[PDB]
Amino acid sequence: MYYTIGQVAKMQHLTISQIRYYDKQGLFPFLQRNEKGDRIFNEEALKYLEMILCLKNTGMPIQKIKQFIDWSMEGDSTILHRLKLMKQQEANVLQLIQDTEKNLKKIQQKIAKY
Amino acid sequence: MYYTIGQVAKMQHLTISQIRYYDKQGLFPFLQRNEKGDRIFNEEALKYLEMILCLKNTGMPIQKIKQFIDWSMEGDSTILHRLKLMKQQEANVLQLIQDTEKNLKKIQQKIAKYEDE
């Protein structure tokens, strides 16, 4: 099965415009074309999509995500580079959670004050 | 005592230009004047800055943050408005944490995977 940008957009609660914009940014070099020439996502493509959105939604710069995608398609020769990257993002995301909790507390205290 | 835009930037680990952006966006209507005529931060101005940053760091749109500031300036006649805004943000931040935990799970699974070898 090869899913279309429209189906992917539906799956992700995103618009066709957003997905096309990411495509435009060079984030989907792994897309292929079906018999109709439509740019489609195979199972693997969707998994890459999940991570792309994950990294994007956790503050990783586009250029860095593209770098991650490039390494993934290069093969296990970059497995160490990628592991490093993910470990770094885990560390970054744990900090995000920590900082967001700190902000939640300020918000809640303000609510108490009111 | 007051503090300069520059000192506040250092304390808030902000760049001089970042704070000026918030200024242009009209988020510091509460800034005072020193004997010279410069605009500075007193203790209350800083408390407002911390919230501005808190709301901005949690994704609140700039226009709503300004709306929060303007309401705070109007006095306790907007207490219900402000209370409401915070309650919605709290709800938004709770969702944000859950969404982030979900993302953390995806990154961790990828880590487990990479440790194939």
A12: domain CATH number is: 1.10.1660.10
CB contacts, 8 Å: B54 with chain A: 103, 106-107
CB contacts, 8 Å: B106 with chain A: 50-51, 54
Distance from B92 to chain A by nearest Cα, in Å? 10
* Resolution of the entry in angstroms: 1.9
The token pair that represents B67 in the structure block: 């709306």
A92 touches chain B (CB under 8 A): no
Are B57 and A86 a contacting pair at CB < 8 A? no
Are B99 and A57 a contacting pair at CB < 8 A? yes
CB count within 10 Å of CB B102 equals: 11
Look at residues B57, B69, B60, B58 and name the one whose alpha carbon lies nearest to residue B26.
B69
Instruction: Write down the experimental method used for this entry.
Output: X-ray
Q: How far is B93 from B95, CA to CA, in rounded Å?
A: 5
The token pair that represents A59 in the structure block: 């503050």
The residue type at B25 = Q
Where b means 16+ CB within 10 Å and e means fewer, B39-69 reads ebbeeebeebbebbbbbbebebeeeebbbbb
Contact B55, B65 (CB under 8 A): yes
Are B86 and A110 a contacting pair at CB < 8 A? yes
Q: How far is B61 from B59, CA to CA, in rounded Å?
A: 6
Contacts of residue B66, defined as CB under 8 A and 6 or more positions apart, other chains included, come to B25, B26, B27
Segments forming the whole domain that contains residue B98: 2-117
Q: How far is A54 from B100, CA to CA, in rounded Å?
A: 9
Q: How far is B89 from A111, CA to CA, in rounded Å?
A: 10
Are B58 and A83 a contacting pair at CB < 8 A? no
Q: How far is B98 from B50, CA to CA, in rounded Å?
A: 24
Domain count for chain A, please give it. Answer: 1
